[PDB]
Amino acid sequence: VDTCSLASPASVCRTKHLHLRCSVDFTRRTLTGTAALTVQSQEDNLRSLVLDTKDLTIEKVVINGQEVKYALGERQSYKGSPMEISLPIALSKNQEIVIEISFETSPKSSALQWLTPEQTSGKEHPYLFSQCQAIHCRAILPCQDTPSVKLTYTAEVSVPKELVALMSAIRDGETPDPEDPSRKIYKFIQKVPIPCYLIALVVGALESRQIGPRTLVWSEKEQVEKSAYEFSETESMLKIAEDLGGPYVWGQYDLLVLPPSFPYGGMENPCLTFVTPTLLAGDKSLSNVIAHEISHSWTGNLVTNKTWDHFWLNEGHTVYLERHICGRLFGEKFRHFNALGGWGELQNSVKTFGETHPFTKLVVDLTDIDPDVAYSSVPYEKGFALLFYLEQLLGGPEIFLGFLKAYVEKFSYKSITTDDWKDFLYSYFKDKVDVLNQVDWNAWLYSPGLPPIKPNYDMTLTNACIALSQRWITAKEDDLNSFNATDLKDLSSHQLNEFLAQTLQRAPLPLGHIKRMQEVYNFNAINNSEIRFRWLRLCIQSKWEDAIPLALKMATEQGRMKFTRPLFKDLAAFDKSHDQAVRTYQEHKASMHPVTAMLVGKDLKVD
Ligand SMILES: c1ccc(NCc2cccnc2)cc1
Ligand SMILES: [Yb+3]
Ligand SMILES: [Zn+2]
Numbered sequence: 250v251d252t253c254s255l256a257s258p259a260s261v262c263r264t265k266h267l268h269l270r271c272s273v274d275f276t277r278r279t280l281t282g283t284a285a286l287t288v289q290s291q292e293d294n295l296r297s298l299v300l301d302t303k304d305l306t307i308e309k310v311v312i313n314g315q316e317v318k319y320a321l322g323e324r325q326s327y328k329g330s331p332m333e334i335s336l337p338i339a340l341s342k343n344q345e346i347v348i349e350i351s352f353e354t355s356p357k358s359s360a361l362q363w364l365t366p367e368q369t370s371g372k373e374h375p376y377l378f379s380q381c382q383a384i385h386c387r388a389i390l391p392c393q394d395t396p397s398v399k400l401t402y403t404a405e406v407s408v409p410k411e412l413v414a415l416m417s418a419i420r421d422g423e424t425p426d427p428e429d430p431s432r433k434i435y436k437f438i439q440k441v442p443i444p445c446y447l448i449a450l451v452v453g454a455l456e457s458r459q460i461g462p463r464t465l466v467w468s469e470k471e472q473v474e475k476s477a478y479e480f481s482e483t484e485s486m487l488k489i490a491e492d493l494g495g496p497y498v499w500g501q502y503d504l505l506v507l508p509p510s511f512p513y514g515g516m517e518n519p520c521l522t523f524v525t526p527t528l529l530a531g532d533k534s535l536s537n538v539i540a541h542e543i544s545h546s547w548t549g550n551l552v553t554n555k556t557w558d559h560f561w562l563n564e565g566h567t568v569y570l571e572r573h574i575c576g577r578l579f580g581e582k583f584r585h586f587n588a589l590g591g592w593g594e595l596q597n598s599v600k601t602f603g604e605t606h607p608f609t610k611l612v613v614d615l616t617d618i619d620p621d622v623a624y625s626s627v628p629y630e631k632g633f634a635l636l637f638y639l640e641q642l643l644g645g646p647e648i649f650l651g652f653l654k655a656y657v658e659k660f661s662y663k664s665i666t667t668d669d670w671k672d673f674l675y676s677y678f679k680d681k682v683d684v685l686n687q688v689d690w691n692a693w694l695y696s697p698g699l700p701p702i703k704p705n706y707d708m709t710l711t712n713a714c715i716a717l718s719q720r721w722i723t724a725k726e727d728d729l730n731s732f733n734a735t736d737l738k739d740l741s742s743h744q745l746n747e748f749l750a751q752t753l754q755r756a757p758l759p760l761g762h763i764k765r766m767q768e769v770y771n772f773n774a775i776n777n778s779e780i781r782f783r784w785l786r787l788c789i790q791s792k793w794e795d796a797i798p799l800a801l802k803m804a805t806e807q808g809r810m811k812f813t814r815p816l817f818k819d820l821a822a823f824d825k826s827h828d829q830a831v832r833t834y835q836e837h838k839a840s841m842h843p844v845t846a847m848l849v850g851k852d853l854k855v856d
Contacts, residue, residue: 565632
């Protein structure tokens with residue numbers, strides 16, 4: 250039961266393939282065309298079925314060359330409106346038909362952001378990008394919008410001829426549009442079955458540069474050189490991912506670097522990972538996000554969660570693989586450092602929600618909950634903490650990586666629940682079942698709050714961060730002079746970040762301390778987005794007015810929700826910036842990403 254979808258479930262029928270033929274109209278901000286669904290009945294005598302839709306305009310539905318009857322149900326908030334289609338002939342079990350739906354999107358499509366030329370790098374052309382996860386695919390095309398169904402797809406996309414279209418698929422050529430010579434048609438094929446949340450489309454003034462044997466980087470011209478360098482470790486990460494997970498089956502691993510309003514650090518669209526330009530630190534320091542997106546090529550895209558209640562399967566195993574990639578590249582002490590930081594972020598998320606909040610559960614119940622509202626670090630870090638704890642219980646990383654590989658092999662091309670995972674865990678480790686039975690499954694999987702057991706972490710790289718943070722927190726006024734730029738001498742960017750994270754957990758600090766920190770460390774000069782984010786939060790929570798314009802600028806000049814949401818909230822909580830925060834939100838709202846706009850608005854208690 251997928252409680253987020255209004256469509257016929259996989260038990261009733263299942264989409265096998267989508268052929269998408271559409272045209273991107275920047276003047277109207279609509280995508281217009283046809284979705285031909287090849288649908289296989291799972292039932293005897295099937296006479297109707299139901300698809301998800303959201304703010305779609307349906308022109309007609311055609312089966313066997315003729316228009317058929319359909320009806321759009323009443324809108325159910327964020328889930329959209331169900332579309333019931335009356336089949337012309339009753340179908341037997343396993344019979345397949347093709348249903349061709351003519352449709353057009355709304356400019357308000359929660360799947361899409363339409364950018365004016367002035368919102369891009371080049372300032373001449375507009376730009377469009379999608380983001381379907383979790384349940385926004387229904388906002389682009391009518392579909393069974395549930396990850397419990399996997400389909401192949403092909404697409405032909407007509408765009409203004411000066412622009413480029415890309416999708417989560419292999420590029421299959423380009424031509425002039427025979428119906429409109431100011432246009433080009435780009436073609437795409439995705440031969441590996443995917444859940445519909447992995448369908449993606451970008452259209453803009455895109456250039457590419459090759460950075461490995463199976464990876465091009467795509468962006469506007471002004472970001473291409475910087476991106477090629479930032480992500481140069483991509484091939485080496487892919488090789489390691491393939492060693493841990495099995496064959497990379499998707500063909501290409503390209504990267505697309507989006508404009509700054511892109512709402513997530515990255516999105517694992519198959520063949521074309523989408524990433525935030527806030528990763529462009531200049532020193533490859535935020536490359537863990539690439540490792541994470543690469544890892545999804547196995548955990549998430551090959552083995553997929555059956556419903557969003559089981560999202561942690563996708564994320565926990567991805568973070569687990571991500572951290573192994575980073576440990577291979579930079580050493581086991583480094584894996585433990587990132588693991589231990591992740592526990593910190595989990596502490597934060599639980600503290601923010603409250604230790605009894607249902608969204609701090611590992612398996613959640615999304616009945617009547619917008620998935621975008623529930624989204625947090627919990628499934629990532631609670632899921633990782635579970636896997637790390639099991640690793641230590643069951644004999645160590647080599648042993649647990651054997652399990653992870655066998656798990657991917659077992660459930661490739663399938664969608665699964667937590668009980669499937671747990672069942673296979675018990676099967677794989679059946680000689681260690683007595684150890685497995687010592688795990689508090691109910692607490693770990695189903696209870697709110699921090700997990701019942703914290704794993705063991707190497708502290709080596711973290712000690713200096715904690716030590717410096719403690720010096721600052723325990724400092725009195727007459728200790729401030731002792732701080733000096735040399736305190737940072739032997740700290741990496743990852744350590745400066747962890748120092749700020751540790752300090753931010755005890756915020757506010759006295760204003761005099763924060764002013765001193767700027768004096769001696771000049772954190773205002775650091776443009777690493779993770780570091781700047783935490784520093785600005787520490788400044789604002791410690792009531793430093795000078796930081797207000799800095800925080801407002803970062804909150805609005807990029808749109809990664811990880812950064813924009815807490816910055817707006819912090820600025821709302823500070824009396825001196827509260828009205829500015831609300832005003833700035835109001836002014837920027839119309840040009841923000843629709844989901845980001847909705848969430849910041851809720852956070853601010855606005856509109
Ligand atoms: C992208 C956007 C929203 C979601 N939401 C599903 C979800 C959130 C938190 C916990 N469990 C499941 C997932 C991906
Ligand atoms: Yb003193
Ligand atoms: Zn992920």
